């Protein structure tokens, strides 16, 4: 089935700053991926993105009975939904799970790659740092960044390229909004 396909997208966006305080609403319309016209809350009336949207902006601005709804969206749509859902989105807090283990690999020669896996946490804001017998290991540690599991939890692996010498202890420390105090996992 190789018949042409034609895609239509619409995105009703609500941008929040300092909470439900300073808000901005966007009414965006797309043909494939090119947005062609949109209502910018900060602008007041639909503006044409590309020339393919010239007719749509002129047509909608005419109806001031319409322009009144979109101009009230920040309060009627955005701020309203933010309140309904902040209980379980904005305030959502999920404990991270920290596991430290030796890489089931070792691409680096005779150096042992130590992995610190932080799993199932929310929100996305988190901070993972490695420690050796006291002191931080800034160099020789790269991560996967933030990974989304798609089910409202994240994971991130912060690997550490270590040079093995028995008599040392390794500590992975995590600080997250859901934590009362840093989580720490040691590896001997």
């Amino acid at each position: 089935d190789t018949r042409p396909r034609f895609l239509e997208q619409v995105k009703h966006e609500c941008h929040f700053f300092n909470g439900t305080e300073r808000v901005r609403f966007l009414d965006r319309y797309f043909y494939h991926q090119e947005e062609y016209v949109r209502f910018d809350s900060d602008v007041g009336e639909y503006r044409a993105v590309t020339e393919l949207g010239r007719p749509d902006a002129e047509y909608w601005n005419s109806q001031k009975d319409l322009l009144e709804q979109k101009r009230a969206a920040v309060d009627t749509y955005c701020r309203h939904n933010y309140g309904v859902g902040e209980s379980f989105t904005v305030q959502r807090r999920v404990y991270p799970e920290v596991t430290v283990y030796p890489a089931k690999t070792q691409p680096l020669q005779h150096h042992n790659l130590l992995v610190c896996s932080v799993n199932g946490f929310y929100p996305g804001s988190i901070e993972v740092r490695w420690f050796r017998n006291g002191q931080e290991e800034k160099t020789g540690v790269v991560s996967t960044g933030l990974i989304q599991n798609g089910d409202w939890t994240f994971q991130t692996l912060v690997m550490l390229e270590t040079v093995p010498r028995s008599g040392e202890v390794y500590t992975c420390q995590v600080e997250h909004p859901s934590l009362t105090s840093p989580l720490t996992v040691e590896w001997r």
């Binding site: 042409p4 034609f6 239509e8 619409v10 966006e13 494939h32 393919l52 859902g85």
Partner: protein
């Protein structure tokens, strides 16, 4: 501290695929199941805390379909440009023997929103326990999607995420095994 809620919707022809959903900071809150015409919250919890009348979504989709008729004609019948997806396979959490886990197949940066994903375990396909999401919007207006698979980690099992999409001239495969 800064957040974003997006009500994204799309319509596809000649497939007549329609989608309506809410996205808060990159995660899905719910989408409306077009065939049954009932709302589906990503997490059961969301359900008893907030509600959405499906019927209001079919309304908008019906319009997106109407506007599509218009735009197609306007763009002088310009079809979309297939964009193949980059497939990455990974696990929900650190993997440990006989300890229930989840294999995730993340399909990214693609469009149009029509893909066919399959899970293979040592050759033959597996379909028990699997689950998936609808297409998630990306800021660049392409799409994402997740497919899950529960399993008991073994030493001899090699799992395969198989993805098909018009942008790929041939089906893709993404291997994953313990080691």
């Amino acid at each position: 501290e800064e957040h974003v809620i997006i009500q994204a919707e799309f319509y596809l022809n000649p497939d007549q695929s329609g989608e309506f959903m809410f996205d808060f900071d990159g995660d899905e809150i719910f989408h409306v199941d077009m065939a049954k015409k009932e709302t589906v919250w990503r997490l059961e919890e969301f359900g008893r805390f907030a509600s959405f009348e499906a019927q209001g979504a079919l309304a908008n989709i019906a319009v997106d379909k109407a506007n599509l008729e218009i735009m197609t004609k306007r763009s002088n019948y310009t079809p979309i440009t297939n964009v193949p997806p980059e497939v990455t396979v990974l696990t929900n959490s650190p993997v440990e023997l006989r300890e229930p886990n989840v294999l995730i197949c993340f399909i990214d940066k693609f469009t149009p929103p029509v893909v066919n994903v399959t899970w293979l375990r040592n050759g033959k396909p597996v379909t028990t326990g699997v689950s998936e999401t609808v297409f998630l919007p990306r800021e660049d207006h392409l799409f994402r999607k997740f497919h899950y698979l529960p399993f008991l980690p073994s030493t001899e099992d090699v799992y395969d995420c198989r993805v098909e999409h018009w942008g790929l001239d041939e089906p893709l495969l993404k291997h994953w095994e313990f080691d």
